[PDB]
Symmetry: D2
Subunit: 442 residues, 4 copies
């Protein structure tokens, strides 16, 4: 019974000097070759266990789910200061949210998404096939879904309030560091920056908490059970400053997710620009199953292997969350013939699975074959886990994947796509590059 | 026996919603007004104790030094994984470095010689408008080089530049408000220091190099004449590799960088207030005259200039929050309780601007550090280097760099800029700017 | 969310000054009246949560079994010193023993108890109805069972080796303390005496181990699989797939048998006080088993009264009034209080066995407790002399079978008498030493 | 490099409990020392404990690193989650207070040291009067010694000694030394080890004690009486000292102190019992002592504390008695406070530690004949008292006996005064006195006769 093997560390720095010039990911890969699927690396004085390949990540997150579900120290409340019960309250809250998101699936996403998909088309027609940067377009459409689900009705793309919160929630801003400043941090035991809060993207923060209040007010007055129209009055029901903020927090979480959805699309479309023959096939399957006279609907995905396989492939290659979200072991645990002590930090390196050779004939090339059998139907591939697995698997998986199928097909149904750059010359290597694309009505 | 009071937190966010639009500092200040000199705020789910004003910070860092000296979780080794002894080795190593830095206090001469080189470079400027940023990084850095490798680099030496590049290479990481709220909810930050890549070529070239210098040193080294910090390394080694040095080197640079900025800020300040620069140039002529380089012993006979430099460090306030510490033992502080392992901010800024110690906390004012007769006077609020068990290891070097570099410059040149003094905006890190050095 | 209420403590002593003159149990009871079913008391500087009444104990040990299953600090290994894996090894070992004991129940255990039951009768016949102290007799019979189960064959009552180990395992010996010596201990944080501390603890044992070695040898020297004949070669098999483990296991088995023996001793005295009950039982015996065959386990089903009586005996006897203290594993929410991980907890078994909400007359001998109107056995939730939950007695099966068979077989072949008239028997947790006479019914 | 103290490998549940000498835990520690050295790690149950052997090792720990090795056992550590801090701290200050008060008894101006000396002197006197009234009868000094040492504590706490047969005295002599035993089988113990919980626990016994409720009452009476009559700045005894800290929980706090004090007195009493038996076996030593007594104190005044200075032999002898007696062989276990570096090993905060006092009192590097009675241990060539570092029957460091002062003064005075006025004899001939204890480190029971020297 030993700890997962790893490279020996240096004081202050840990293994920070043995990383590939190529990046932390390459490092983890070369490390795997030497030490295997489970190993121990050091960021500063702290050890972390790295999990590589499908099988290893699955065993951990799935087979021993309770053991591997813990959050990072920043998220753990100190009873000595807050006492328990806030611990537990949070507990019940989580379960509640977790429960509500299943209900959403069981005018649900399918219809709301079908609506938004329409609006998108109309906007794309009004583009009159102009070259543009889809970034704002995709953020808007994925976001609206969240809005319809939370406040009850989509915003108009140019609605002040919408923009103000599209602004708040995706406002970029960067913090700056020198190599020296960092080594020092490592030596302090404290990072320079911490979250909180927007500076000029905080301008609207004041307005958005405020907007929430208003919507809750309106909602409250017309509220009726057992007729909960959207998430707000669901809140109001569990209920029946702090409340407005509690909402925010959910809202924020939801947006953190939508942003990934949006990027998954952006990446997907660029990818399709590089590979028009695929886009063609998909347009074909579309015409063969949905035809030309009705909107695509969620039930169609079943009868459209290629397109699904293609979307799967997009999530796979895209790999937007390569490291997964780090967890924290809950109980001293026996894993793959090693030991992992309660409170060890752990990386399920999702990327190492999405590119796992034992599961993907060509881990680095775009290849729908990954998800198709001889007969050409969708086939399960265990390496496909872009949403993670286990107790903490994405709360948004359902909504997101439905967003991806519908937004994707509806678009390819009504338009074809082109760019200045010739397919041969599209560089897929990165977040996906900003680019220009043109939507042409069919 | 209670915990330090504070604003009630929200789930996930903590007190992150009750901060002033104006910034974390303003918040801490308004908070002080309401809860007092010691209070408790929440970043995420985690509590942190904030320390405000001279008296409070001093009590903590100085009076209860052992209690308030702990480092952040990132810096704490886990025995279950590494075992103890590496804990202890580090321990002894620290004491060693701590001991060596007192021995260093040489420095005086090396600085003086660098001071000279600076002057010659400033002459060659032929009074051209420039951005002193690179100049100051170079001069302060060389000191560290002379102290570690044994001899200054030439300002344009490839190796120098390559490491001036490694150690100050800026690079930024980017975050959305949403990405952040999510981090808070994960318990994990997106970015960890140094994980980033990486100037890999440069770090690698140096690592290779230190090797070289150690080699050379090894072959020619001897006692009781250990020339520079490398041998001292070689000696502690021979008494019982390239990587430890690097780490020290980095630490040293992290510091030098602050020294450089303290100068940059100082000079801009003097551009806004030429009548002060005049006085200083006067005291310089009255005490050091015009025919010898300023020397450390001069500071004693030059109150004004000292007071001014003090005032510069005060206003500059480059480390407003101090470096967060970690309580070591359950402790009784100012009639509250602080549990072992509580994170703590000694908000240095709150002292450097403490009204109980500075007649005009927010205006440049050398009177802060002068009595009626006009001699240097101790001001307890002056704590830019922190205080206590972990007070700056570089305090000595740094302050010596500041006095010499400052005076020598003002001795041989006067300064001017496009922007008229009335129009210099001191509000921020100090703005990038242009300045001209004119020989006297 | 608060901690369980309780009396305020004093420095060093805790609540040790507020105990009834009557004993710790009375205290817990008076405490219950004031603070309720869950409260917090202090032994020295250390808090402990006390659990009172059936419902409370059950909720804890049963409903939240994983939460309330932790052992005392003495039993918790320090990884810094021993590393994990020994932690885990122990873990798997436990499960193993736990598994083997269910198998024992699945040549068999019942027969082994029946054969011993016979031997008991023959010894009781050879008593020629002499007044004696059944203490040694009962320790012997219950012990043999363990020996048949472990080494494969009963010892003869006067076999040297038997006696030598009957001696080791039940050898009494006492340690002595002054009130002052104790207050001081409380102030040191350390007790004067430690289990296993004694010189004799060691001496008895070395001799014990040697016999084991031999039996393992023999057993080792002759087994075939799955021709395994008892616990030894079961050991040998898990090994092939030492004496030290066997010994520990055996000691725990004896720790238990000792309770079984006392349960009998108490039972018989009780019956001396209440001959009209003994009569009934002798009657049911004749009505169901008759006079010409030994009682058998299957008979208990068709003998409500007798079962009810044995239940009543365990209930009143209350040999483990405080239960075996446990240690909360996870921060927990219990009965609208909070209990922090690592809190020590008493499930005061006695408070259930005497719970008014479940026993018409908690303090008088009353088989009615376990019978319905029609006179069949009825479940009573308060009956938990073996504890409940993840750590419920490993020996429950064997013990209860020992109790039914030993009891009935005896009362079938003999009747009982004493000098003292039932009116005078003293109930006065150990049962008084006494004299009893077994008279054949021929 | 940096490693934990070495030791024998443990077994599940049992730890090292199977590798102990048949001879007893002490012999074990000794044989273990031979193999692993002065600092090693043994396992009681699943718990590790660090064992400290020999003078040098114990001294380095308790003395050189005193703050590091001063921690109490888990039973004595308050949980903040339940009690909050401050009770932690209050206790702290309380301790210091008691610690301060005990020095005030010993030094050395005002009430100070002499008042205490006088009390022992008086209670010593009665011992003589009582011994005269024995008319040289064979008796068991156990109760006599418990009484005399106890009274000191009473004079110090309540302000005046108790008549030896005074009901209240007896009642509390009874409470505080009342023996009572709990019983265990080998199996019941193995099980405990497996539970993580011991069967018994201090005070958890109902019997302790009927008198407990009544004494407690006594204190109230005494505190009451004291309260009305007391006055600073002359504070007569510990009660009004309490009253003063109060005026600046009532009996409970006193009771606890009282108990602690008695726990100690009991050791003092045994030290005497042992001492006297020892002298019965070695009458030629008793003669010498009686001689020094006559040569320094003469025959016409009571011995006084200042005499010890001028009486090397007798002192050396008493030292030797404490040494051989070894009433607290294991010392009182402590608890490491801070992760520590000790003798080139590592000891983690919260490790339990035994400073095996016996291993020092019998340390060959300090005692020519560790196992024989030998005053030479504490004398130089010239025959004066010489310091012996191995002599630490009171422990050392931050937590060294609070009673060292009183106790040692009790031992010198009680001892000499007695040997001054009587000589001693027993049925058993010296050759035949067996000094080895009985199942316990406690001295074997015995009969002795005090004969006046008139
Ligand atoms: C479209 C592509 C998306 C991907 C690949 C993605 C991926 C993930 C991943 C990797 C996690 C980590 C689970 C873990 O911590 O183990 C996650 C969790 C989560 N996802 Fe998403 N996300 C996406 C979009 C969304 C969306 C649209 C939502 C909208 C609700 C969302 C909500 C969440 C939330 C709230 C969690 C938290 C996990 C937890 O319960 O602790 N994500 N998602
Ligand atoms: C220019 C003015 C400088 C200022 C105002 C400054 C300020 C500080 C402050 C406030 C700390 C707080 C330490 C703590 O309590 O955590 C610190 C630490 C430190 N400083 Fe500087 N510094 C300066 C220049 C330098 C230089 C040139 C060096 C060269 C080596 C240096 C080396 C260090 C080191 C090694 C520490 C480590 C603290 C520890 O041991 O925990 N500093 N400094
Ligand atoms: C009337 C007879 C017995 C009674 C009343 C009894 C009662 C108990 C009780 C109350 C416990 C504590 C469960 C807990 O930890 O909460 C226990 C545990 C145990 N008993 Fe018995 N016992 C009896 C006989 C036996 C016998 C014959 C064995 C033989 C194996 C035995 C073996 C054990 C063992 C090995 C445990 C360990 C508890 C655990 O694994 O958590 N007991 N028993
Ligand atoms: C006659 C021989 C005595 C011996 C050998 C003795 C020995 C000890 C020892 C070994 C300790 C443990 C200290 C430690 O943890 O290192 C101790 C503690 C103590 N003893 Fe004594 N004692 C004696 C008599 C007394 C007497 C008469 C008193 C009367 C007050 C006394 C009061 C105490 C007290 C109050 C402590 C508290 C220890 C602590 O503060 O942690 N002892 N004693
Ligand atoms: C550390 C912490 C968080 C993350 C992170 C990963 C994915 C996302 C986007 N997202 C949100 C919900 N599902 C996916 C945000 C943050 C990565 C490293
Ligand atoms: C959090 C992390 C690092 C720090 C820190 C502050 C100042 C400095 C500059 N410095 C380093 C040594 N002397 C000055 C580096 C890092 C503060 C908060
Ligand atoms: C604390 C420690 C041990 C015990 C204990 C409980 C039961 C027994 C007898 N026993 C053990 C297993 N089955 C019955 C011995 C000790 C109780 C409280
Ligand atoms: C473990 C726990 C307590 C003890 C103990 C030692 C000495 C005493 C008596 N005593 C009182 C003052 N000095 C010693 C009581 C208990 C020893 C080992």
């Amino acid at each position: 019974g030993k700890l997962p093997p790893g490279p020996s560390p240096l004081p202050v720095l840990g293994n920070l000097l043995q990383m590939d010039r190529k990046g932390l990911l390459r490092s983890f890969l070369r490390l795997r070759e030497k030490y295997g699927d489970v190993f121990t690396v050091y960021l500063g004085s702290r050890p972390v266990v790295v999990l590589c390949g499908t099988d290893a990540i699955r065993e951990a997150l799935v087979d021993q789910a309770e053991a591997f579900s813990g959050r990072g120290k920043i998220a753990v409340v100190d009873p000595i200061f807050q006492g328990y019960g806030v611990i537990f309250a949070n507990g019940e809250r989580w379960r509640a949210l977790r429960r509500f998101s299943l209900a959403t699936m069981r005018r649900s996403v399918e219809e709301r998404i079908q609506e938004e998909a329409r609006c998108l088309v109309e906007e794309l027609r009004k583009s009159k096939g102009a070259l543009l940067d889809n970034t704002l377009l995709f953020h808007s459409i994925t976001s609206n879904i969240i809005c319809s689900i939370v406040f009850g009705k989509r915003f108009d793309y140019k609605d002040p309030v919408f923009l103000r919160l599209l602004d708040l929630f995706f406002q970029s801003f960067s913090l700056i560091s020198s190599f020296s400043s960092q080594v020092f941090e490592l030596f302090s035991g404290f990072l320079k920056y911490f979250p909180g809060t927007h500076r000029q993207i905080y301008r609207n923060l004041q307005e958005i908490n405020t907007f929430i209040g208003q919507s809750v007010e309106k909602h409250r007055a017309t509220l009726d059970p057992s007729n909960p129209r959207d998430f707000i009055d669901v809140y109001l029901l569990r209920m029946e400053f702090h409340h407005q903020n509690l909402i925010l927090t959910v809202l924020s979480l939801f947006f953190a997710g939508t942003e990934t959805t949006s990027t998954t699309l952006r990446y997907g479309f660029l990818l399709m620009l590089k590979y028009p023959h695929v886009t063609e096939r998909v347009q074909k399957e579309i015409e063969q199953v949905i035809g030309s006279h009705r909107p695509p609907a969620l039930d169609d995905r079943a009868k459209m292997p290629y397109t699904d396989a293609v979307i799967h492939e997009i999530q796979r290659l895209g790999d937007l969350i390569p490291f997964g979200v780090p967890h924290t072991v809950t109980k001293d645990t026996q894993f793959r013939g090693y030991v992992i002590p309660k409170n060890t930090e752990v990386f399920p390196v999702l990327s190492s699975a999405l590119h796992d050779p034992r599961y993907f004939e060509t881990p680095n090339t775009f290849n729908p074959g990954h998800f198709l059998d001889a007969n050409g139907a969708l086939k399960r591939n265990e390496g496909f886990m872009p949403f993670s697995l286990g107790k903490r698997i994405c709360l948004g998986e359902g909504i997101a994947r439905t967003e991806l199928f519908l937004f994707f097909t509806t678009i390819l149904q009504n338009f074809s796509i082109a760019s200045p750059v010739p397919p041969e010359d599209i560089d897929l290597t990165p977040v996906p590059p900003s680019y220009q694309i043109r939507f042409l009505a069919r």
